[PDB]
Amino acid sequence: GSLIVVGTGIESIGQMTLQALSYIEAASKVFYCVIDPATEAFILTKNKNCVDLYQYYDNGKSRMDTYTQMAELMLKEVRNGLDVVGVFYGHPGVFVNPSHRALAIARSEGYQARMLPGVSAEDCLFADLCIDPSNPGCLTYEASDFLIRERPVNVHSHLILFQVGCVGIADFNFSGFDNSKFTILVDRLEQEYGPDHTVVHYIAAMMPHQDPVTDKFTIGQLREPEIAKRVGGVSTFYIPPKARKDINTDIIRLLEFLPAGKVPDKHTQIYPPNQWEPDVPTLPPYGQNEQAAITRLEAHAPPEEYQPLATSKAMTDVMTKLALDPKALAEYKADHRAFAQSVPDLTPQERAALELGDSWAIRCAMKNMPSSLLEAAVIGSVVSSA
Amino acid sequence: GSLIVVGTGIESIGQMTLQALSYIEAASKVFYCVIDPATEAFILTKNKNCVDLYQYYDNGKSRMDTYTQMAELMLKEVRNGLDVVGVFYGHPGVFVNPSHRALAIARSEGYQARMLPGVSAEDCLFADLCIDPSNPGCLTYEASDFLIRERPVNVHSHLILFQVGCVGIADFNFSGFDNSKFTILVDRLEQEYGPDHTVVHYIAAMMPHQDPVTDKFTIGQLREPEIAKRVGGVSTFYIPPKARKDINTDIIRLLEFLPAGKVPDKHTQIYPPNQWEPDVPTLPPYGQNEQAAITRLEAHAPPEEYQPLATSKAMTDVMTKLALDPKALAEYKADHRAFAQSVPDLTPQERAALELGDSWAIRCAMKNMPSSLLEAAVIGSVVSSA
Ligand SMILES: Nc1ncnc2c1ncn2[C@@H]1O[C@H](CSCC[C@H](N)C(=O)O)[C@@H](O)[C@H]1O
Ligand SMILES: Nc1ncnc2c1ncn2[C@@H]1O[C@H](CSCC[C@H](N)C(=O)O)[C@@H](O)[C@H]1O
Ligand SMILES: [Zn+2]
Ligand SMILES: [Zn+2]
Numbered sequence: 001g002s003l004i005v006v007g008t009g010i011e012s013i014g015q016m017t018l019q020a021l022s023y024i025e026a027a028s029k030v031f032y033c034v035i036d037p038a039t040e041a042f043i044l045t046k047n048k049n050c051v052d053l054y055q056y057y058d059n060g061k062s063r064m065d066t067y068t069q070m071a072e073l074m075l076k077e078v079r080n081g082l083d084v085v086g087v088f089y090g091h092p093g094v095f096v097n098p099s100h101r102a103l104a105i106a107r108s109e110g111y112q113a114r115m116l117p118g119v120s121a122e123d124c125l126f127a128d129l130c131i132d133p134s135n136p137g138c139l140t141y142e143a144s145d146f147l148i149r150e151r152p153v154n155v156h157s158h159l160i161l162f163q164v165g166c167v168g169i170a171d172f173n174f175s176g177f178d179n180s181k182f183t184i185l186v187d188r189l190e191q192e193y194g195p196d197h198t199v200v201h202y203i204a205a206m207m208p209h210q211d212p213v214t215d216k217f218t219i220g221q222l223r224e225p226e227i228a229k230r231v232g233g234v235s236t237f238y239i240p241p242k243a244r245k246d247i248n249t250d251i252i253r254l255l256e257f258l259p260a261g262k263v264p265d266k267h268t269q270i271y272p273p274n275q276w277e278p279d280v281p282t283l284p285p286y287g288q289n290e291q292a293a294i295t296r297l298e299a300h301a302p303p304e305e306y307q308p309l310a311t312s313k314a315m316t317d318v319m320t321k322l323a324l325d326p327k328a329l330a331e332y333k334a335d336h337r338a339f340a341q342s343v344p345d346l347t348p349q350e351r352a353a354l355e356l357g358d359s360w361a362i363r364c365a366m367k368n369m370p371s372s373l374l375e376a377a378v379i380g381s382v383v384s385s386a
Numbered sequence: 387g388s389l390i391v392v393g394t395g396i397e398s399i400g401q402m403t404l405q406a407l408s409y410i411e412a413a414s415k416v417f418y419c420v421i422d423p424a425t426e427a428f429i430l431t432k433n434k435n436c437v438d439l440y441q442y443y444d445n446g447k448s449r450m451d452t453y454t455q456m457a458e459l460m461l462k463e464v465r466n467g468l469d470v471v472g473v474f475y476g477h478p479g480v481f482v483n484p485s486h487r488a489l490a491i492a493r494s495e496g497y498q499a500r501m502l503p504g505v506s507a508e509d510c511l512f513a514d515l516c517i518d519p520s521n522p523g524c525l526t527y528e529a530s531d532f533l534i535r536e537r538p539v540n541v542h543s544h545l546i547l548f549q550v551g552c553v554g555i556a557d558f559n560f561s562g563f564d565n566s567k568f569t570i571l572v573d574r575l576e577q578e579y580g581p582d583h584t585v586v587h588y589i590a591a592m593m594p595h596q597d598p599v600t601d602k603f604t605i606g607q608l609r610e611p612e613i614a615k616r617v618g619g620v621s622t623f624y625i626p627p628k629a630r631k632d633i634n635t636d637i638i639r640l641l642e643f644l645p646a647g648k649v650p651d652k653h654t655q656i657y658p659p660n661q662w663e664p665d666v667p668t669l670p671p672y673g674q675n676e677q678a679a680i681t682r683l684e685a686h687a688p689p690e691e692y693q694p695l696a697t698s699k700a701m702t703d704v705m706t707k708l709a710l711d712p713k714a715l716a717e718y719k720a721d722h723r724a725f726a727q728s729v730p731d732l733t734p735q736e737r738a739a740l741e742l743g744d745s746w747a748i749r750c751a752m753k754n755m756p757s758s759l760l761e762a763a764v765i766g767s768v769v770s771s772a
Contacts, residue, residue: 012709017403037697069682100658103516104657104658117395119505128501132482133526139524142523144643145520145521145523148637148641148643149522149542168640174689255533272489293455296451297455306443323400359596
């Protein structure tokens with residue numbers, strides 16, 4: 001037996017990866033927890049043997065018990081010698097208890113266990129809010145865990161909080177959560193950021209035609225019942241930096257990031273600014289260096305050492321096959337020589353490269369195939385803090 | 387004109403989302419920065435008009451200049467009235483300057499600008515290391531920015547560092563980076579975590595048959611030239627928690643997470659443990675509560691209020707179409723009535739639901755279609771700290 005756990009992303013159907021889909025298709029048995037009905041419907045057309053894990057939540061039932069069951073249902077089948085696929089919406093290991101639970105148990109018992117990544121709600125937040133986690137660093141917490149364990153804030157970096165809709169709730173209810181302890185989360189955020197600092201209420205669109213909720217509030221507004229009512233089981237908070245941290249220009253020098261003895265402006269960031277953030281000194285989009293780079297584009301030719309793609313249909317076909325056909329990949333991994341020998345239309349260099357399996361060899365083969373004469377010459381909580 | 391920016395994920399071809407692929411296909415013009423040759427080859431079969439952005443890096447050329455150019459090339463075409471698709475490997479907004487740069491400029495100039503999320507190397511790290519960012523919180527930094535701005539560590543939460551392969555390098559070289567300031571990063575990590583704490587050197591597999599590098603070291607080992615040589619342009623560091631933070635059992639009480647006047651054990655975590663972490667008191671996989679939940683599965687029936695999927699082929703088809711056909715989605719968004727009227731085989735409830743467009747209506751329609759008589763009765767650095 002074996003367990004593969006895959007994701008579906010957040011927005012229905014379209015945010016599923018190609019490999020997630022091919023593993024769902026190849027499974028003996030599929031267990032899924034998805035919250036968009038069209039994704040569910042899609043999944044059912046792809047495998048004849050699926051079980052909805054959502055039926056294992058209940059009113060007044062500890063989510064922890066639900067997660068134990070979701071994990072055991074998959075493990076039963078793995079122990080029976082089946083190739084099971086677990087499917088969880090988003091990324092299946094981001095704020096999901098039973099995926100990790102089932103995988104760690106499977107691994108302990110000596111079964112093949114693999115998780116494939118997906119697009120998380122945080123990934124969606126980056127995209128819909130056009131923020132880059134690198135500028136100026138990103139800290140992500142579960143909201144109750146943030147409270148429970150008094151986890152430190154970082155006011156100079158992005159803050160993302162999941163499960164703001166179920167603060168201190170160990171439970172479930174089909175009617176939704178009664179987020180009565182929400183006020184405690186606001187207290188903490190006010191203590192850390194002040195009632196006037198920005199909080200974005202974020203809900204990624206689940207249907208392709210839907211708009212994201214990207215509502216800019218102040219933390220103090222979260223105390224108003226009309227505002228607070230809208231934060232539910234699919235709500236995430238984004239808290240922008242309160243201030244930026246100075247560049248340490250002496251560390252700049254030590255790293256020799258810039259020419260010797262030079263200094264950047266300590267207070268200024270790179271274009272673009274973060275829309276959701278209070279004003280920060282930011283470089284203009286088209287200063288001297290940018291104009292120089294743009295005027296230089298006219299003179300541009302590809303550098304000597306740049307090597308363009310130079311492959312064939314047959315090579316492109318086999319690589320595509322290895323990515324999209326789990327069976328063919330398992331065959332290739334079991335025996336590189338036999339598999340490579342069977343591939344149609346491969347050049348002897350392509351063949352040998354595939355035979356070797358080395359990343360260097362394959363990359364070289366795909367850049368060295370001559371093409372011209374010249375060249376040849378909504379309640380989906382799947383984790384709990386408790 | 388318009389700009390859509392999409393990702394390809396990390397592992398070749400298979401980690402591309404369905405929507406990324408459909409937007410690449412529909413584009414007038416495609417600009418791409420991908421580092422796996424098979425993904426490049428795949429992309430070229432999907433659109434007839436592509437430009438490789440990789441040719442805009444050069445030896446001794448400031449990456450910032452490269453990013454200015456990558457962004458301007460896309461913006462030129464947007465200004466010409468084209469529907470441009472920018473493609474960046476991974477998630478196109480995670481540690482990527484020019485995507486954000488081009489989008490913010492496009493938006494300022496009044497063009498339609500959208501980023502679609504993808505699978506990041508961090509998403510891959512979660513999956514390959516089976517860690518959950520929620521336990522016990524996740525902090526992500528760019529490595530040079532971590533140094534430059536003396537960003538605080540959090541020894542009780544996960545730490546992820548990108549671009550460990552190019553510390554204090556503003557530059558590029560086709561032969562790879564000369565990571566001479568790497569030692570400065572080690573100094574900081576030793577200062578914060580001690581020479582004996584774990585660091586995982588992580589490289590997600592780029593080819594479907596490749597294994598990830600998931601090498602467990604101590605921070606002190608990073609000083610050895612034989613170890614340090616292997617950290618390159620696609621290297622990420624994972625630093626597990628040094629210790630766990632106590633539950634504050636008085637905050638537990640305030641949130642009424644558990645029955646009144648009850649207490650959990652302050653020092654104990656939920657199963658499973660984190661493989662990469664030093665020993666932590668962890669609950670066993672099958673204690674009393676888990677066995678209770680499992681024996682209870684035998685008695686299990688779906689709760690009264692659980693509503694199984696109950697839709698039709700025609701509805702599933704149209705929802706699938708809206709997810710996978712950008713043109714059909716644009717048509718639907720332009721006019722809900724006319725589009726819904728045109729859809730084959732829709733039930734009048736399905737029709738009206740599609741006409742309304744409301745998430746509630748569509749979800750209700752997909753759970754209320756009766757099916758029985760009873761029921762009817764390698765150098766890819768795309769960001770810089772500078
Ligand atoms: N459409 C959506 N928009 C914003 N956040 C969402 C969301 N769906 C789920 N979430 C976040 O995820 C939490 C449930 S945990 C499930 C997360 C999912 N595995 C993922 O990859 O993101 C919610 O409480 C919320 O914080
Ligand atoms: N195969 C791989 N494995 C691990 N980390 C990787 C990787 N490819 C890229 N990275 C990380 O990404 C950095 C370049 S920034 C590009 C990141 C990409 N947009 C993404 O979504 O992840 C590298 O320095 C490294 O830290
Ligand atoms: Zn200044
Ligand atoms: Zn104890």
